[PDB]
Design a protein around this ligand. Structure first.
Ligand SMILES: Nc1nc2c(ncn2[C@@H]2O[C@H](COP(=O)(O)OP(=O)(O)OP(=O)(O)O)[C@@H](OP(=O)(O)OP(=O)(O)O)[C@H]2O)c(=O)[nH]1
Ligand SMILES: Nc1nc2c(ncn2[C@@H]2O[C@H](COP(=O)(O)OP(=O)(O)OP(=O)(O)O)[C@@H](OP(=O)(O)OP(=O)(O)O)[C@H]2O)c(=O)[nH]1
Ligand SMILES: Nc1nc2c(ncn2[C@@H]2O[C@H](COP(=O)(O)OP(=O)(O)OP(=O)(O)O)[C@@H](OP(=O)(O)OP(=O)(O)O)[C@H]2O)c(=O)[nH]1
Ligand SMILES: Nc1nc2c(ncn2[C@@H]2O[C@H](COP(=O)(O)OP(=O)(O)OP(=O)(O)O)[C@@H](OP(=O)(O)OP(=O)(O)O)[C@H]2O)c(=O)[nH]1
Ligand SMILES: O=P(O)(O)OC[C@H]1O[C@H](O)[C@H](O)[C@@H]1O
Ligand SMILES: O=P(O)(O)OC[C@H]1O[C@H](O)[C@H](O)[C@@H]1O
Ligand SMILES: O=P(O)(O)OC[C@H]1O[C@H](O)[C@H](O)[C@@H]1O
Ligand SMILES: O=P(O)(O)OC[C@H]1O[C@H](O)[C@H](O)[C@@H]1O
Lengths: 443, 452, 445, 443
């Protein structure tokens, strides 16, 4: 049961030599990753049911075509593939076969350890994805949120979305469900009411995530950054403003990434508004969160972030006001509106981190350390926990090597565990499906 | 002199180019008795997205027309604040406001200000049909050469969530096939198809969704527009608003509705049975979720009784398969194109559709008029449904429209008479409509109608 | 040999009754005008300028209006073969063709009291709005240009360069839809639009049914408007223009320059902002000297406040206009006026009232210096239209056949100074395109 | 103002910082003289005498965080309107930046680019064309490449304006060598045509090369300037982008192109290709074409009159033909799975892709003999015309033919004899040099 999809959105003008490299990489051991990311995309609107599915790349003189063998029928309306899903499909080929292949094959001097190279790559990737619009006045609000979230948390984030869209702002989330879908959903409705024509709804994700988490159907720009170290850096550089909702260990982990970069002294003059918000009930959640930050980083971290409870209008209003300040801030520095080139991200924050049980129990989670190293290695630990929850390698590794164990001191490790268990009690650790098994053991 | 909230809105969408003498027309008509109407229509528009209860909270509101040499501007005094963002009027409400200005003070204003010699009135079905065209062209709803995608959806204002989601789902399939929606500019079944169609449009990167809302002054004064509408049109008569529905449409889908939705159907079915329209293609398809099976079965029995079992060659009833409902309309789009190509008719306005003058003639819901409705099978099915349409439109007057909402206790509640089995098959439907809350949204409902 | 033209640009959406109306209007005696205006449109340039002579070759032509349910179409019977590319009517001509259906059969046919100066003006707005010429929310860029239907190649070159400069400053041009001066600026402005990547060129040709039937549209025009009177065509020219560049011309260009100056010198329009520049190519020195020498003491001495003369600086001329734009935009905000239409300009009913030459009417011309500056220019405009009527306008040509040259009355050295102007027009070969000699329909003194 | 800072327009709009760096290194390298001279030329669209009239001119690359700007020291006063660079000049300027410093720099200093493989040289030409956003995707064929002399009389210049008009009347675009005479009048005529048919979005490409551009500024009609590295690859891009060629009356070069074409057309694997070649002239041209036809038939084969067609003084027919052929290409493309914008399928033989160093030793080893296969013939026939063209404008070749000896070539005498009659006629046609100063042969 075979369908020949032509390119939409991406990979339209391919050279004949590139077409050959795409076909090679698609026969390589990368196949399954390119398969699954491609089956996920075809299944936005929620893997093991579609074991018949297989996607073959097809060489034509002009460019490439994708062949869909036993694809999921709901991605087709009267025969034709839904345009959005078709384009996400080709975005996966772009950022899986094209991107992730090319960075290993070859490229003369791609250090991949020079934090310069690393940032220029994240620029390149966004550029190839046609996501850095030239002469674009700043409108993008990177939203961060938890994937399992309450109907009230959802209804609240939809309202924040709607107010953002009523102020002609665009959204960039994790390409996923719950809080990454609901701001897009709400913004769309505002855009409409204000006759906004061209909505951008970027979804920023990574290969391991997108294999088990389809995009939400709202995304119209799908970027698969290779590692969360890049995905996170990409979040920061493209955004002109961040709103961190109630999330789990992922959303938590992103916060430390921000705060690691924002506290740096080099970025004392950079302009990137951070606003943690939530509904009236989230107030307790933020309490703990905030105290946890104060204690790990200082009262000096509260200067970079602001908490608004149960005022979505103001939350949007604040960002719509900030946008003229992100514009001027980039104008003075001679920076790009698209890409926050000037922001100083620390090699300790860009360096890929492999979440091995060893690495997690040698984390420098001690107060005798600079705040940078603390939040950096904090984040490192928050990524392993995201590992044992969703990423395939982690969910298996915890059930075969045993939970992650963590070092540190108490009050530090003490308070965090109060976060972690608190997260579970809110069920933001795992989808409502079944229950949750801690992949972590904190003293 | 007291504390007031002032804003000035510049024309968006309509009334952008205005000669100076026209500007004088509008200002005069806005001092005319038409003010109160104009005011409450513009109030209803502002209150899109939030029943007279809302309108008795904005009694401080007043809308004043401003002259400038170039054209016009609209002054909002104590406007509802929920219609502004950071002090700026939401663009959509801004255009709908200037739609109201067009269709109430320009359109309906020039009409209200014409002679009505009842000795020699222009009952000409050509006027009513060229007029209906002229109204749509002024509201820029008639796009040259745009191929047929408009699907006119009908349904009750008060419907149950199961219906609402179904109309929503039907909407989704409709838009997933790059099809536009036209409705009654209202809540319930009149917004839920747009809501779902919207999502389909997105998934397919369908730019320029047209969600036209055909209403009428009475309805819109009391019922603000539903938020999904982008082209708002305020046709003067339910008689002309109906006819507009029919001509612009390239497909019709009737959901489960109360009196209004019923009355439109008879109006439609009447134009479909007319012989000159045996070669005209316009797909009519009633749909609803599973629970509406019964409703429609009754519905059918009423129609076949009033029209014959030959009615059923003009519609098709689909239950719980919104995908197919859209699939079919989508399939029928090419037919309507060629049907218009052959005859040389226009995509936008069905000029060849013969609509009968007794279907185009307005029916004042006088209680005397109402019982004089010849509801007898000896008459052509044409005249049977014409009067049957007219009866169904009276009940809606008693329920929503001002004249007859209160004109009913004064001059008395409505009473219809004719063939008894006809009146009987009506009561099951009407009294069924009461049990489905398709008459009124409910907390309270008065019959406003009486049959032996 | 028949071909079927569907509507392009205008008369796209039409109600069945309207189509019905156009059908009858086409069967009326207007047919000749409607077919005559249609024939010029279909000839435009095509490397032939013969006034009426070229058109005599197409005596078999005929255009019938067709009625379809959707709208209207146009039937071309024996149409000039040069208006077709491999069978397809060239789109510009097709649009200009359909503009004649709009403005001859729809507009002109249907002609509200037309002596009320208010109704007149709002009629002129309604004609322009119909041709979608008053665009909404457009910063001012329109420089109306006036000139001569006949001009040596010297002036043509200059006005291309003026037009090139003008275009190079993202300025659109508007003329009288004719040749020579009414084409050159567009020809260059277009070039200039290219270099500065200005995509939406707007080259408006505004004309009357009297002129279009004998002077076809130059092919540069992409917005054609056929206003009914020269009186209404002029009124339009003024309202839509945000600047005006007068080149050298004959008696027609002359007719405008008094029209305009009359309106500007009126007191109510002292605060209005409309930059008037006269430019010529160096050799125009004397022509502009004798023109200025004429105006100074025929009309007011103070009238040199309302025009600036520039010779052989095409750059500066366009620069000045490109600076004037923001002032005109400010002048409209302050008045709360529109950019597209200058409503506030007080145009006198004496400048709105059509003029029929005859001969008594030329005798009853109050050309006296005692007369107000205004009254003087109103009838001074009229005098020139006489010479423009019997020059080319068929009604006037026949009228100078029977009763001969118009007897221009007036008085004062005013008459002698008209004569040495008029003598120059003919002596400079700006009164008739080269082909025969010229027969003065004017008898001064 | 004597200094002005021009922003990127049309190219080089989105640049990564590592890129912005490499550009300045290349501006600091000896390439500057080329980049200066091409940028002077671009700015003088409105003869190498004007090069010595602007000696103080100098153009510098400004680095910014966002991207690059261009610093213009003492530019020709004619390029600015009220101080603002003419939008079109500005974009030509940045195409010089794109194609001299980015393209020309990067390929010479690399090496995984073999540049000796005909698969490489071909995909490079695709690449540069894509990079200059000139290969439009999903564009129905309309691109009519027009070849012809730079020194052509007023009858030919006017005729090509007519064949240009007629092409525009029929909504066809034009591509030439960014030059005067025949390379301008078509575009001049074509654009009137596009006006008359309300054709918006005209395309007027100009393929040229660094040695050419620096002494011959682009004509003012060109809106896409493309500067391919050499004449060998310039021609390849000519061919491959074009859906139809018209060869006007030209000299050497217009000579050199035709043998290039014919070499590729007569080659067997290209007998199924669809690319009309109409050689047209204005009636007095009959004699020049006569001599031309007699020449090829002998020098190649009477089997060559299959690939070209001669029309004289029928501009409307020349256009009429090409418009009919525009659909025929589409099928020829759609069948093979080829791209409408690039003619991937055509087999250009490597002998025609390999740059020919116009040296005297090399000019001797030109197999100019009728025993060789018509393919081999052509290739070396072309190489010979690259030699003479060098003698005329190319710096390398004007220097080599100065005191170091005019270019000398021989072979079969009938062949040689045909040549001297042609070349002699070119001199007599003043197609070899523009001005009336008598021309001195390099042959
Ligand atoms: N600074 C900045 N400019 C950008 C960016 N993306 C596009 N641009 C535009 O590039 C233009 C460059 O103008 P400048 O800021 O004065 O130049 P700079 O780069 O800062 O250094 P320079 O002084 O030349 O040496 C701006 O036009 P204007 O500001 O003059 O007018 P407007 O925004 O209204 O359109 C911007 O609109 C960006 O990320 N940062
Ligand atoms: N008659 C009519 N035509 C419409 C309508 N909407 C779009 N069109 C188009 O306008 C074009 C005019 O077609 P005609 O040549 O005039 O049809 P004819 O029957 O031959 O003569 P007639 O209309 O009676 O005067 C149509 O065909 P095309 O040129 O596009 O090609 P195509 O027709 O192949 O689809 C349609 O595409 C409409 O409501 N009515
Ligand atoms: N004068 C004029 N204005 C128009 C026209 N069409 C829209 N407008 C808008 O009207 C604005 C005038 O400014 P306002 O202070 O708000 O006055 P208005 O309410 O519009 O009328 P009012 O003058 O008070 O009677 C301009 O915005 P700006 O703030 O940018 O002012 P600008 O472009 O002039 O620099 C225009 O954008 C028009 O045809 N003429
Ligand atoms: N060959 C070609 N196709 C292009 C190009 N750009 C887009 N396309 C489109 O890609 C479609 C390919 O359809 P396919 O089913 O795959 O059939 P083929 O063309 O034979 O290629 P295939 O062998 O399957 O790989 C074409 O549809 P149609 O063939 O029906 O043509 P159109 O719609 O434009 O009128 C084109 O519309 C291009 O540069 N070249
Ligand atoms: O917070 P979780 O939902 O538990 O983990 C994934 C998140 O990590 C990132 O910040 C994205 O916003 C994701 O939403
Ligand atoms: O309650 P109902 O009157 O039945 O619902 C309102 C509908 O009746 C009218 O015809 C309009 O089409 C509306 O869609
Ligand atoms: O009659 P001419 O003076 O020779 O030229 C025609 C002029 O008369 C009209 O007003 C046009 O705008 C032209 O300026
Ligand atoms: O001026 P000529 O030297 O005679 O001709 C040179 C041609 O060869 C090149 O392809 C260019 O496009 C030119 O058209």
């Amino acid at each position: 049961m075979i369908t020949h999809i032509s390119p939409l959105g991406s990979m339209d003008m391919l050279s004949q030599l590139e077409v050959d490299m795409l076909k090679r990489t698609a026969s390589s051991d990368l196949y399954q990753l390119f398969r699954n990311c491609s089956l996920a995309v075809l299944n936005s609107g929620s893997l093991s049911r579609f074991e018949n599915f297989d996607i073959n790349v097809l060489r034509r003189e002009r460019g490439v075509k994708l062949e869909l063998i036993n694809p999921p029928e709901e991605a087709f309306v009267d025969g034709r593939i839904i345009r959005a899903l078709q384009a996400n499909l080709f975005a996966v080929l772009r950022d899986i076969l094209f991107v992730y292949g090319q960075i290993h094959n070859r490229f003369p001097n791609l250090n991949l350890d020079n934090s310069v190279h690393i940032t220029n790559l994240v620029f390149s990737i966004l550029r190839n994805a046609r996501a850095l619009h030239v002469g674009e006045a700043p409108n993008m609000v990177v939203c961060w949120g938890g994937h399992s979230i309450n109907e009230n948390e959802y209804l609240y984030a939809r309202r924040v979305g709607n107010q953002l869209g009523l102020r002609e702002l665009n959204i960039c989330t994790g390409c996923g469900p719950g809080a990454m879908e609901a701001p897009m959903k709400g913004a769309a409705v505002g855009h409409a009411q204000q006759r906004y024509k061209d909505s951008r709804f970027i979804g920023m994700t990574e290969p391991s995530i997108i294999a088990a988490e389809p995009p939400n159907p709202l995304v119209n720009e799908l970027i698969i950054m290779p590692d969360i170290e890049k995905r996170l850096e990409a979040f920061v550089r493209i955004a002109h403003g961040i709103i961190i909702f109630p999330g789990g260990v992922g959303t938590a982990e992103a916060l430390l990434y921000l705060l690691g970069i924002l506290m740096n002294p080099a970025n004392k003059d950079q302009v990137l508004p951070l606003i943690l918000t939530g509904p009236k009930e989230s107030a307790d959640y933020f309490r703990v969160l905030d105290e946890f930050v104060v204690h790990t980083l200082g009262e000096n971290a509260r200067r970079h972030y602001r908490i608004i409870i149960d005022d979505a209008a103001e939350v949007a209003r604040q960002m719509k006001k900030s946008m003229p300040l992100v514009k001027e801030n980039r104008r003075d520095t001679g920076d790009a509106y698209s890409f926050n080139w000037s922001m100083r991200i620390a090699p300790d924050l860009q360096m890929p981190f492999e979440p091995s049980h060893e690495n997690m129990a040698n984390l420098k989670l001690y107060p005798d350390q600079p705040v940078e190293v603390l939040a950096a290695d904090l984040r490192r630990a928050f990524s392993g926990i995201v590992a044992g929850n969703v990423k395939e390698v982690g969910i298996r590794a915890i059930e075969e090597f045993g939970p992650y164990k963590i070092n540190g001191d108490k009050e530090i490790m003490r308070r965090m565990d109060d976060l972690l268990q608190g997260f579970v009690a809110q069920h933001r650790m795992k989808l409502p499906g079944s229950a949750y098994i801690p992949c972590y053991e904190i003293c």
